[PDB]
Design a protein around this ligand. Structure first.
Ligand SMILES: [Cl-]
Ligand SMILES: [Cl-]
Ligand SMILES: [Mg+2]
Ligand SMILES: [Mg+2]
Ligand SMILES: [Mg+2]
Lengths: 125, 204, 222, 195, 233, 211, 195, 221, 195, 195
C-alpha cells in the first residue's frame, strides 16, 4: 500500500499539511454555534453565487448524527461526509454495546480522534 | 450410567484387640439428588455383620437373600453361621451371577464365637475374597477411605479407641465424596456385646 | 488416531505454616505399568522464594515450569529486578494455563512460598488456570488418599473437644516445620502402600525467609 | 406421566399426581388419574414409560386383591411395598424391563400410623415423610425440608402441598394441567374434589 | 496425525563408572510383523554423544539429518567448535526434546522414542530419554518399547540406584547389555540377531561396534518338548 | 448454587463454596462472588476457570470504562461486555452461568443473568448452578418485595443451605452479600456444618434428617 | 510357517516353534506338529486355543473310529477336521494341514484352510496368517523325492519364511511318516539360518 | 507375577501377593497359589474371582475323580478339565494359570491361556510381570537345576516382577512339589516390602467424635 | 423462545410472542419481550437458539436505525424484510450459522397497507395474512384458515388471536407463560397492556 | 511385482504389466518402468495417480538440476523422490524403487517405501501391496552377476510373484541401464509361465 508520510514536522516544529488543512476550513462557508439556557442553535452560511440550485435535494449543511446530536462544519464538503458517516456508525455502535445513546462529549472525542489519526498515518492527508 | 455410583455410599470395617468395628454413611441419592438420609447399609445375621455399598436395589435384594440363606443355615445346622463360613457363602452367591452380576461391594465383619478371633473380609461384585488383618473399605469414597485407614490405623486398638479411629476414617472420607454422607452409623462388636452409635456430621 | 496426552503418575503435596511453607513430591515417573525413573524430580525452585510442581502429563508439566521460570526472568528485566510476590506469580500462572484453554496442559499445579507479610502461602490451579490460596493441598494420582487425612490432622476437621458433647471444636493452630514434615512423610508412606504409581523416593522443598532447603527420604520400590 | 408427590402427616398420607397425558406435541388428556387403589387403606401413584405404568399398576392391584380374597385380610402397607419392590427388582434383569416409578401411601390399621413408600423402576425402596419421582423432587424437596413439620394435620399437609404445586407451576417448563389429590387415613381413601 | 509404517524396536542403555553404553538391533519391522534388515539406529554426534532412535524409520532418518545439520551449524563462526564450544549431549538432547514437544503440540509428531547417551565436558555421564509426546526422564538404566519391559529389569540388577554406578565397570555393563540384547532376541518378534553397540568413555573416548551377533543362545532343550500337554511322542 | 434477588432494601447475593471434579470434592472454600468494583458483584457457576478468568477480565474492562468516561459503568453495560465476549467464543466449549448485580443512580438495583450460550436476562430473582431448583423452591415460597433487610439476608442464606443439603455438588459454606445505594456489604462466610444444626434447632425444620 | 511334503517312502511334516501375542513371543519352543493318530499328524495355524480344541476332538473321533472299524485313512482324518472347521466356521479361526501314512495309499497331504474346505495336494505350505501358497517353487518339488531331499526342501522353504516373517521363528521341527515308523527331527537356528 | 520352574526331581511355582483394582492396591498380601489337589498346585493371573472359582471347581471335580478311580490325580487331568472349561466360555472367564504338580507319571509344568490354549515348558511366567520375570528366567535358567537352584531362580523371577512391575508387589509365595515327597507350600517365603515405622501416632483423644445417639444391639435369640 | 404468532388485518399487523425463557428444567423468566422495534412503523419478533436470537435482532435493529439516520427516511417493510432475508441467507453457509426465525410486521405509509413477513433461519421469506414459527403453526394455521377474514378490524383480530392462544394453552405440552401482544398501524407501534 | 538388481555392467529394472480396480484389470499392458532421467529410472507401486504425479515432479526437478549443475547422481534422484514422499506421506500412497547408472558409481538401487524413508540396496523386490521383501533368495543373488544371469534372476522372481498374486500379471517388462545405453526387454506369458 501507499505508505508515504505526508504529515511530517518542519524545522520550526510545524506540521504544514495540518496547517494547510486549516486554510481549507478558512475558505469554507461560515458556521456558527450559540447555546442558550434550554437550547443550542446552529447557524450556517450558504454562498449566493449558486442560483438555479434545488434546495430540496442539495446536501444540508447541518447533519443529524443521532436523534439528539447534530454536526455542522466548515471546509471540504466531500471530507465532511466521511466524518459524518463514521460518527453515525459509532452512534449506533455505542447504543448496541453500552445500551445508551452517546454523550455529545463522547461523539466529539471520537470524531476528533479520527481527525487526529489522519495527521500521523502513512499515505493519508 | 455406572450402576456402582448412582445411589452412592461407603462401608469401612476394622479389627482391634478382641473386637471388630464396621461403619457406613446413611445417604441414598439418585445421582445429584439426595433422596433418603436414613438408608443403613449394615445388616446382621446373628453375630455376623454385612455392609453392602453399590446399587441400592441390589443392596436391599442381597440383604433379603442372605437373611433367607442364613435362616435356612441355622435351621439345618442348629447353630448361627460364623464369619469365615458366611464369607464363602457371599463369594459363592456373587460368582453364581458371574455374567449378570449384582453391582455391590460387600464387607463382612464379626468375631468367631468358638476361637474369639476378630474377622473382616471384602469382595468385588463377582465375589473375589479380600481377607485382611487391618481394614476393608468399599463404595464411592474407597480411595479416600484407603488413605484415611492406611495413615490412622494401628494394630490391637481397644474398643473405645477403635471407635474414634474408624469414625474419623469414615467422616473425613465422606466429606471428600459428593455421593457419601448425610449421617453415619458405627457398630463396635465385642465377643458378647455390640454398641451402635450415630455420628453427628455435616449435612451437605 | 494420535493421542497427544499421557499420564506419568506421581503425587504432590503443599502445606503452609505460620512463617514457612513446604511443597513435597514423589520421585517416581511411570507410563502404564512400567517405571521410567525411580528419581525424576518434579518439584522445582523457580527463584524469588517460589517452589512449583506441575503434576500429571510430565511433558506439559516440564513445559509450564520452563515457561514460568522464564516469566520470572523477564519480570526482573522489565520491572527493575523487583521480587515476584507469590500472589503475582499465581495470577501469572492462571494466564499461562488459560492461554491453552482449548488445548490444555494436563497437570495439577501447586506453588508454595511466603506472602508479602512473610506468612506461609500455597496456591493450587486446575488444568485451565482457576486457582485459590489454601493452607493445605494434595495433587495427582494419590490426592484422594492424602487429602482427607490432611483435613483431619492439619485443619482438625471432625475432631471435637473431649467432654464438650461435640459442641466445642478442637481449636485451629499453626504446626511447626518438624510436625508438618512428619505428616508429609506419613502421607506419602501411606499413599505408597495403597497406590501402585506412588513410591521410590520423596523430595520435600521447605521455603522460609532464609531461602529454599531440600530433604530426601526413601519410599518402597515395589 | 411426570409429577407424583407424597406427604405423610400425623394421621394420613396425601398423594398428588399430575392430570396431563402428552403424546408427541399434543396433550391428549387433562383429567388422567395416575393412581390405583391396591386395598381399602393402600393407594399407589405411578409415573414412567407409556403403557408399562398402567399395565404394572393393574397387575399389582390384581395380585393384592387376590391376596385379600384368599386370606380375607388386608396386607400391611410395608408388606405391599416389599411385594411391589420385588416385582420391580425382577423386572430390571428381564428381557424388557418395566420402566415405572411408584409411591405407595397406606394407613396401617395395626400400628394406627400413616406410611409413605418411594420405589423407583430399579426396585430401590425407601420409607419417607415426603417423596417424589423424576424432576418433581428437585423443586419440592427444598420446600418440604423447610416447611414440613412431623405433627402436621391433613389441612396443614394440603396447604404445604399447594405451596409445592405453585412452585412447580412457576418453575417447570411443562403444563402438567394441575394435580388430583387423594388422602389415605384410618377411614380409607377419599379424593379432594377441588384443588 | 499419522501412523508409523516401518519401525525400529527397543534401544537399551545404562551408565557405568566412567561412561554410558547404548545398543540397538539393525532391523526395520513392517506392517504384519514382516521383517527387513540393514538399518543403523545408533547416530554418533561428535565424539562424546550417541543418539539411539526407535519407532518410525522415516522420522528417524529426518532426526538423523537434523543432528548432522546441527553439527554443521555449530561449526559456523566457531573457532572452539572442536574444543570448549563443541556440542554436548545435554545440548543435543534439549534440541531434540524441544523438537519432539512442539511437533506433538502441532498434532504432527515424530513417531520415535529417543535415548541420548554421552559424556559431558566435565566427565559427567549423560543418559536421558524423549518420545513422540515430548515426555523426558533420566535413570541409570534407560530402554524403549520391549526393552523397558525386559531389558530394564536385567540392567537394574547391576545398577538399581545412583550409588551403584561407581561400583559398575565397563566389562560388567557391556556383558549386562549384550545379555539383555539376547533376551530381546528370544522374546521380541520385531528384534533381529544382528545389533550395534556404542560405548562413550571419558578416558577412552567413543567406541562404536557394528555387525555384532547374539551368541551362546540356549535352544537344545526344545528337542525334549512334545505337544501341548498329553502328547508323549 | 448461586442466587441473587431484588427487594425493598436492594439486592441479596448468596452462593455456596463447593468445587467438584466428577464425584471428587476438590474444595469447600471457593469464592464464587467476584467483587469487580464497590457497586458491582459477579457470581460464578459452571467452569471454575472460565468464570474466574473472564470475570476478573470484566473488572479490568469496567475499570478502563471509568478511566475513559470518568464514570462508573452501568450494570447493563458491564453485563453486555461479558455477554458479547462469551458470544464470540460460542461453540468453543466455554461453560458459564453468572449474575452481574449492582446499583447505579440511573438504573437503581439491577441483576443480569449471563450464560455461555449468550443469553443475557434482566430479572428480580435468579438461581444458577446444579442446586438452582432447591434454592428456587425456598426463595419463591417465602419471597416478598417488602421483605426486611435482616429477613432477606436470612432467606438468601436459608435458600443456599436448602440447596447445599439436597444437592450433592453444592455445599461447604454460605457467602452472603447485600447491595444498596452506598454499594455492596459482605455479611460473612457461614460454614454449612455449623449453620445446618443451628437452623434446624431454631427453625425446627429439616425433620427428614436423623435429629 | 508349516508345510507337509509327500515323498517316495511316505510324507514329512515341518513347522517353526514360535507363538506370538502381539509382538511378544509367548512360546519360542512351540510344538506345532500334533498327533491325531499313530501315523496321522497335522500342522496347526491360526488360534492356538481353536486348533488345540479341534485337534483334541479329532483325536477322540479317530480313537473311537479305530476301536470300532480299525485304522482310519488320512482322508477320514481330513473329513473329521473339515466337519468341525466348516460347521463352526463362524466361531473358529483355524488353518490345518493333515499328513498321514497308509501302507496302501503311502503318503497323503490334505489342507483345511480358513473357509473349512478340503484339498488333497502332493505338498502344501502356509505362511503369515494361515495363508496357503499354490505355487511355492513347483519346479523345486518333484514327485517321489528322497528323505534327505525332502528334509532339505522343507528346511530351506521354512528358513526363507522365517527370514521374512516375525510370526515364524525359533527351531524347525519335522515329523517323518513312513512304514518304518515315526521320526522326530529338530533343526536349531545356527544350522538353518546359513542357507 | 507368577512363574513355574522345573528341576531334577520336581517343579516349583512362585507368585507375588498384590491384588489391584485399577491403580489402587486392594490386598497387600493375597495368595495367588491355589491347591487343585494335594500335589497339584496352580498360580493364577487375570480376573481374581475367575482364577479362584475355576481352580476350586476343577479341584472339586479332581477330588471326586480321585475317589472314583482310587488313584492320585494327574496334572494332565487338571490341565484337560481347565482348558475345556475355559475354551467353552471363549475367554469370558479371565483366568491365566500356571499348572504344576507331581503324580505317578512324574513332574509336569503347564500354562493355560483364558481362551483355552495350553503350553509345555521347563520355565514359564504369566501376568503383567511375566516379561520382567521371563527376562530373569531366560538369563539364568539351565538344564539339570537342583531344588535349591530352582527355588532361587523362581523367587528371583518374582522379585524382578515385584520391583519393575506396578501390577506386582509385596511378598513372594513359593510351592515346591518334589517326586516321592509331600508338596511344601512356603507362604510369605520372602517379605522384602515391610512398611517402615510411622513418624507419629494418630490415636485420637477419646470423645473426639461427636455422637448423636447410642443403643445396645441384640444379636442373641 | 418458542411461540411467535402474526395476524395482518385490514388496517394493522398484530404480533403475539410467548413470555417464557426456559434454561434446562427451570423457567428463568416469565416477562420476556421477544421483539425489537426496527423503525417507528416496523416490528420484528424472533425465536430460536439462545443468544443468537437477541444478537441477530439487535444487529438488524442497529443497521435499520443507521439507514434511517443516513437517509432521514423510513425503509419500507418489504425493503427491511428483503435486507433481513439476505442476512439469514448469508448465515446458513457461514462457519457458525444464526439459528433464528423471525416475523416482520410493518405498516407501509406509502401504500397505506399493513404487511406481515415470515422468514426462517435458512432465509426462506414469504408474505402472509397470518404466520407462525416452530410448532405453534401446527395448531394455529388451520384454526386461522377457518376464522380469519381479510376485512377484519383490530378488535376482531385480537379476539381471533385469543382463540389461537387458548388452543395453544390447551394442547401444547410447555407453559409459555402467556404472550405479549403488539399492534403496528399508521400511528406506529403500541403494546396491548392486558391479555 | 517390481524389482531392481545391480550387476557387473550396471542395473536392470523389472516390473509386471497389470493395473487393477478391485478385481477388474484396468490395464493388462501397463508400463510400470518410468524414466526420470536418461539413465535414472524408477519402478512405481501403490496409487497409479500418486506415483505418476510424483514421477512427473521428480523428472521436472532432475531436468532443472541437469540444466544448472549437469547430470545428477542416482542418490540425488532418490533424495528428490523421498522429499516428496516423506513431506506428503499423509496424502500419498506411493512405493518407489529408483535404479540408475553413473560411469563413476556404476549401478545403484534405492527403495522409497510407504514410510517415506530411503534405503540403498544391491537389489530390491516389492510384491503384493507395495510389500518389499528383505531376504528374497539372498543366496540366489550374487554381486557382479552377468547380464544374462540378472535377466534370468528377475524373470524367475517376477514369474513366481505372478503365480500366487492376482494384482501382478500380463507381460514382464525390464530396462537394462549400462554405459552402452538403455535396453528395453519384454517377456510374454508363454515364455515366463513355464519356469
Ligand atoms: Cl500351541
Ligand atoms: Cl500407471
Ligand atoms: Mg458429603
Ligand atoms: Mg508402591
Ligand atoms: Mg428412589
Amino acid at each position: 500500500g501507499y505508505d508515504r508520510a505526508l504529515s511530517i514536522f518542519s524545522p520550526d516544529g510545524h506540521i504544514f499539511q495540518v496547517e494547510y488543512a486549516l486554510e481549507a476550513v478558512k475558505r469554507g462557508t461560515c458556521a456558527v454555534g450559540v447555546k442558550g439556557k434550554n437550547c443550542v442553535v446552529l447557524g450556517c452560511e450558504r454562498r449566493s453565487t449558486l442560483k438555479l440550485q434545488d434546495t430540496r435535494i442539495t446536501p444540508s449543511k447541518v447533519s443529524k448524527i443521532d436523534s439528539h446530536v447534530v454536526l455542522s462544519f466548515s471546509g471540504l464538503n466531500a471530507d465532511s461526509r466521511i466524518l459524518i458517516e463514521k460518527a453515525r456508525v459509532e452512534a449506533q455502535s455505542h447504543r448496541l454495546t453500552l445500551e445508551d445513546p452517546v454523550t455529545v462529549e463522547y461523539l466529539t472525542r471520537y470524531v476528533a480522534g479520527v481527525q487526529q489519526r489522519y495527521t500521523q498515518s502513512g499515505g493519508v492527508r | 450410567s455406572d450402576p456402582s455410583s448412582i445411589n452412592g455410599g461407603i462401608v469401612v470395617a476394622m479389627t482391634g484387640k478382641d473386637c471388630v468395628a464396621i461403619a457406613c454413611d446413611l445417604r441414598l441419592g439418585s445421582q445429584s439428588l439426595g433422596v433418603s438420609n436414613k438408608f443403613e447399609k449394615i445388616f446382621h445375621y446373628g453375630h455376623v455383620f454385612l455392609g453392602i455399598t453399590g446399587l441400592a436395589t441390589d443392596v436391599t435384594t442381597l440383604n433379603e437373600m442372605f437373611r433367607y440363606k442364613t435362616n435356612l443355615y441355622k435351621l439345618k445346622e442348629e447353630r448361627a453361621i460364623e464369619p469365615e463360613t458366611f464369607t464363602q457363602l457371599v463369594s459363592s452367591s456373587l460368582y453364581e451371577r458371574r455374567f449378570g452380576p449384582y453391582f455391590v461391594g460387600p464387607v463382612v465383619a464379626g468375631i468367631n464365637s468358638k476361637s474369639g478371633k476378630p474377622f473382616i473380609a471384602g469382595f468385588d461384585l463377582i465375589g473375589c475374597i479380600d481377607e485382611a488383618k487391618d481394614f476393608i473399605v468399599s463404595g464411592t469414597a474407597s480411595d479416600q477411605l484407603f488413605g484415611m485407614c492406611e495413615s490412622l490405623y494401628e494394630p490391637n486398638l481397644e474398643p473405645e479407641d477403635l471407635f474414634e479411629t474408624i469414625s474419623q476414617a469414615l467422616l473425613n472420607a465422606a466429606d471428600r465424596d459428593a455421593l457419601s454422607g448425610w449421617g453415619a452409623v458405627v457398630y463396635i462388636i465385642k465377643k458378647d456385646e455390640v454398641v451402635k452409635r450415630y455420628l453427628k456430621m455435616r449435612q451437605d | 488416531q494420535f493421542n497427544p496426552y499421557g499420564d506419568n503418575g506421581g503425587t504432590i503435596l503443599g502445606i503452609a505454616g505460620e512463617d514457612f511453607a513446604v511443597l513435597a513430591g514423589d520421585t517416581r515417573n511411570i507410563t502404564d505399568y512400567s517405571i521410567n525413573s525411580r528419581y525424576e524430580p518434579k518439584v522445582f525452585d523457580c527463584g524469588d522464594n517460589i517452589v512449583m510442581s506441575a503434576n500429571g502429563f510430565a511433558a506439559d508439566g516440564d513445559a509450564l515450569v520452563k515457561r514460568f521460570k522464564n516469566s520470572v526472568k523477564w519480570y526482573h528485566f522489565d520491572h527493575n529486578d523487583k521480587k515476584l510476590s507469590i500472589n503475582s506469580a499465581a495470577r501469572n500462572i492462571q494466564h499461562l494455563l488459560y492461554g491453552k484453554r482449548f488445548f490444555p496442559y494436563y497437570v495439577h499445579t501447586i506453588i508454595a512460598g511466603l506472602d508479602e507479610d512473610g506468612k506461609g502461602a500455597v496456591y493450587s490451579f486446575d488444568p485451565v488456570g482457576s486457582y485459590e490460596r489454601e493452607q493445605c493441598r494434595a495433587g495427582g494420582a494419590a490426592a484422594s488418599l492424602i487429602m482427607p487425612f490432611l483435613d483431619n490432622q492439619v485443619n482438625f476437621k471432625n475432631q471435637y473437644e473431649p467432654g464438650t458433647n461435640g459442641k466445642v471444636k478442637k481449636p485451629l493452630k499453626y504446626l511447626s516445620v518438624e510436625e508438618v514434615i512428619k505428616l508429609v512423610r506419613d502421607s506419602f508412606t501411606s499413599a505408597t502402600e495403597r497406590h501402585i504409581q506412588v513410591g521410590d523416593g520423596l523430595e520435600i522443598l521447605i521455603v522460609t525467609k532464609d531461602g529454599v532447603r531440600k530433604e530426601f527420604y526413601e519410599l518402597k520400590r515395589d | 406421566m411426570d409429577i407424583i408427590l407424597g406427604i405423610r402427616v400425623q394421621d394420613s398420607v396425601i398423594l398428588a399426581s399430575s392430570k396431563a397425558v402428552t403424546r408427541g406435541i399434543s396433550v391428549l388428556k387433562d383429567s388422567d388419574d395416575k393412581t390405583r387403589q391396591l386395598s381399602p387403606h393402600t393407594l399407589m401413584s405411578f409415573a414412567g414409560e407409556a403403557g408399562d405404568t398402567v399395565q404394572f399398576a393393574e397387575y399389582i392391584q390384581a395380585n393384592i386383591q387376590l391376596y385379600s380374597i384368599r386370606e380375607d385380610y388386608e396386607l400391611s402397607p410395608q408388606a405391599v411395598s416389599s411385594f411391589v419392590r420385588q416385582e420391580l427388582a425382577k423386572s430390571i434383569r428381564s428381557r424388557r424391563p418395566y420402566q415405572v416409578n411408584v409411591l405407595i401411601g397406606g394407613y396401617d390399621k395395626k400400628k394406627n400410623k400413616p406410611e409413605l413408600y418411594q420405589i423407583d423402576y430399579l426396585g430401590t425402596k425407601v420409607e419417607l415423610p415426603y417423596g417424589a419421582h423424576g424432576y418433581s423432587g428437585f423443586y419440592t424437596f427444598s420446600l418440604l425440608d423447610h416447611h414440613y413439620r412431623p405433627d402436621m394435620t391433613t389441612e396443614e399437609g394440603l396447604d404445604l402441598l399447594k405451596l409445592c404445586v405453585q412452585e412447580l407451576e412457576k418453575r417447570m417448563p411443562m403444563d402438567f394441567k394441575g394435580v388430583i389429590v387423594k388422602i389415605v387415613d384410618k377411614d380409607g381413601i377419599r379424593q379432594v374434589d377441588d384443588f | 496425525t499419522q501412523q508409523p509404517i516401518v519401525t525400529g524396536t527397543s534401544v537399551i542403555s545404562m551408565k557405568y563408572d566412567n561412561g554410558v553404553i547404548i545398543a540397538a538391533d539393525n532391523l526395520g519391522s513392517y506392517g504384519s510383523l514382516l521383517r527387513f534388515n540393514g538399518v543403523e539406529r545408533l547416530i554418533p554426534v561428535g565424539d562424546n554423544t550417541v543418539v539411539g532412535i526407535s519407532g518410525d524409520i522415516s522420522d528417524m532418518q529426518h532426526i538423523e539429518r537434523l543432528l548432522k545439520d546441527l553439527v554443521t551449524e555449530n561449526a559456523y563462526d566457531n573457532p572452539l567448535a572442536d574444543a570448549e564450544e563443541a556440542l554436548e549431549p545435554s545440548y543435543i538432547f534439549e534440541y531434540l526434546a524441544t523438537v519432539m514437544y512442539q511437533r506433538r503440540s502441532k498434532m504432527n509428531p515424530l513417531w520415535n522414542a529417543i535415548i541420548v547417551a554421552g559424556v559431558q565436558s566435565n566427565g559427567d555421564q549423560f543418559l536421558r530419554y524423549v518420545n513422540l509426546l515430548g515426555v523426558t526422564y533420566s535413570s541409570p538404566t534407560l530402554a524403549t518399547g520391549f526393552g523397558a519391559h525386559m531389558a530394564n529389569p536385567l540392567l537394574r540388577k547391576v545398577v538399581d540406584r545412583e550409588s551403584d554406578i561407581p561400583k559398575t565397570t565397563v566389562q560388567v555393563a557391556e556383558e549386562a547389555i549384550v545379555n539383555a540384547m539376547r533376551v530381546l532376541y528370544y522374546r521380541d518378534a520385531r528384534s533381529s540377531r544382528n545389533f550395534s553397540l556404542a560405548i562413550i568413555d571419558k578416558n577412552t573416548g567413543l567406541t562404536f561396534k557394528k555387525n555384532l551377533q547374539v551368541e551362546n543362545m540356549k535352544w537344545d532343550f526344545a528337542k525334549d518338548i512334545k505337544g501341548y500337554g498329553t502328547q508323549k511322542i | 448454587t448461586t442466587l441473587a434477588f431484588r427487594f425493598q432494601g436492594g439486592i441479596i447475593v448468596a452462593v455456596d463454596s463447593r468445587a467438584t471434579a466428577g464425584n471428587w470434592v476438590a474444595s469447600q472454600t471457593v469464592k464464587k462472588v467476584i467483587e469487580i468494583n464497590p457497586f458491582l458483584l459477579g457470581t460464578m457457576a459452571g467452569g471454575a476457570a472460565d468464570c474466574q478468568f473472564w470475570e476478573t477480565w470484566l473488572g479490568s474492562q469496567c475499570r478502563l470504562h471509568e478511566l475513559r468516561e470518568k464514570e462508573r459503568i452501568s450494570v447493563a453495560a458491564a453485563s453486555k461486555i461479558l455477554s458479547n465476549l462469551v458470544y464470540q467464543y460460542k461453540g468453543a466449549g466455554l461453560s458459564m452461568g453468572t449474575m452481574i448485580c449492582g446499583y447505579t443512580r440511573k438504573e437503581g438495583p439491577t441483576i443480569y443473568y449471563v450464560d455461555s450460550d449468550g443469553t443475557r436476562l434482566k430479572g428480580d430473582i435468579f438461581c444458577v448452578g446444579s442446586g438452582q431448583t432447591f434454592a428456587y423452591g425456598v426463595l419463591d415460597s417465602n419471597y416478598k418485595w417488602d421483605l426486611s433487610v435482616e429477613d432477606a439476608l436470612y432467606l438468601g442464606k436459608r435458600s443456599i443451605l436448602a440447596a447445599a443439603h439436597r444437592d450433592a455438588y453444592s455445599g461447604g459454606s454460605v457467602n452472603l452479600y447485600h447491595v444498596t445505594e452506598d454499594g455492596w456489604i459482605y455479611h460473612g462466610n457461614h460454614d454449612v456444618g455449623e449453620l445446618f444444626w443451628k437452623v434446624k434447632e431454631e427453625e425446627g425444620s429439616f425433620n427428614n434428617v436423623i435429629g | 510357517s508349516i508345510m507337509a511334503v509327500t515323498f517316495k517312502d511316505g510324507v514329512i511334516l515341518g513347522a517353526d516353534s514360535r507363538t506370538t501375542t502381539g509382538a511378544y513371543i509367548a512360546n519360542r519352543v512351540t510344538d506345532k506338529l500334533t498327533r491325531v493318530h499313530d501315523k496321522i499328524w497335522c500342522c496347526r495355524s491360526g488360534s492356538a486355543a481353536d486348533t488345540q480344541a479341534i485337534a483334541d476332538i479329532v483325536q477322540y473321533h479317530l480313537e473311537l473310529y479305530t476301536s470300532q472299524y480299525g485304522t482310519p485313512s488320512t482322508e477320514t482324518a481330513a473329513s473329521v477336521f473339515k466337519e468341525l472347521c466348516y460347521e463352526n466356521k463362524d466361531n473358529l479361526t483355524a488353518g490345518i494341514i493333515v499328513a498321514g501314512y497308509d501302507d496302501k495309499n503311502k503318503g497323503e497331504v490334505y489342507t483345511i484352510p480358513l473357509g473349512g474346505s478340503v484339498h488333497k495336494l502332493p505338498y502344501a505350505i502356509a505362511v503369515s496368517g494361515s495363508t496357503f501358497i499354490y505355487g511355492y517353487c513347483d519346479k523345486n518339488f518333484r514327485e517321489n523325492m528322497s528323505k534327505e531331499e525332502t528334509v532339505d526342501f522343507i528346511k530351506h522353504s521354512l528358513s526363507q519364511a522365517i527370514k521374512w516373517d516375525g510370526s515364524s521363528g525359533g527351531v524347525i521341527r519335522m515329523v517323518v511318516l513312513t512304514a518304518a515308523g515315526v521320526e522326530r527331527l529338530i533343526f536349531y537356528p545356527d544350522e538353518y539360518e546359513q542357507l | 507375577t507368577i512363574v513355574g520352574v522345573k528341576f531334577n526331581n520336581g517343579v516349583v511355582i512362585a507368585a507375588d501377593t498384590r491384588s489391584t483394582q485399577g491403580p489402587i492396591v486392594a490386598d497387600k498380601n493375597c495368595a495367588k497359589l491355589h491347591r487343585i489337589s494335594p500335589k497339584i498346585w496352580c498360580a493364577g493371573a487375570g480376573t481374581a474371582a475367575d482364577t479362584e472359582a475355576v481352580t476350586q471347581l476343577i479341584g472339586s471335580n479332581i477330588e471326586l475323580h480321585s475317589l472314583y478311580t482310587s488313584r492320585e490325580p494327574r496334572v494332565v487331568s487338571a490341565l484337560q478339565m481347565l482348558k475345556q472349561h475355559l475354551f467353552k466360555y471363549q475367554g469370558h472367564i479371565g483366568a491365566y494359570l500356571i499348572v504344576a504338580g507331581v503324580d505317578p507319571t512324574g513332574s509336569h509344568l503347564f500354562s493355560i491361556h483364558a481362551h483355552g490354549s495350553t503350553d509345555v515348558g521347563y520355565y514359564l511366567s504369566l501376568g503383567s510381570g511375566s516379561l520382567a520375570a521371563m527376562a530373569v528366567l531366560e538369563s539364568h535358567w539351565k538344564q539339570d537345576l537342583t531344588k535349591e537352584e530352582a527355588i532361587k531362580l523362581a523367587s528371583d523371577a518374582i522379585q524382578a516382577g515385584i520391583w519393575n512391575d506396578l501390577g506386582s508387589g509385596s511378598n513372594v509365595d513359593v510351592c515346591v512339589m518334589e517326586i516321592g515327597k509331600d508338596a511344601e507350600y512356603l507362604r510369605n517365603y520372602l517379605t522384602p516390602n515391610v512398611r517402615e515405622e510411622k513418624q507419629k501416632s494418630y490415636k485420637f483423644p477419646r470423645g473426639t467424635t461427636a455422637v448423636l445417639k447410642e443403643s445396645i444391639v441384640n444379636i442373641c435369640d
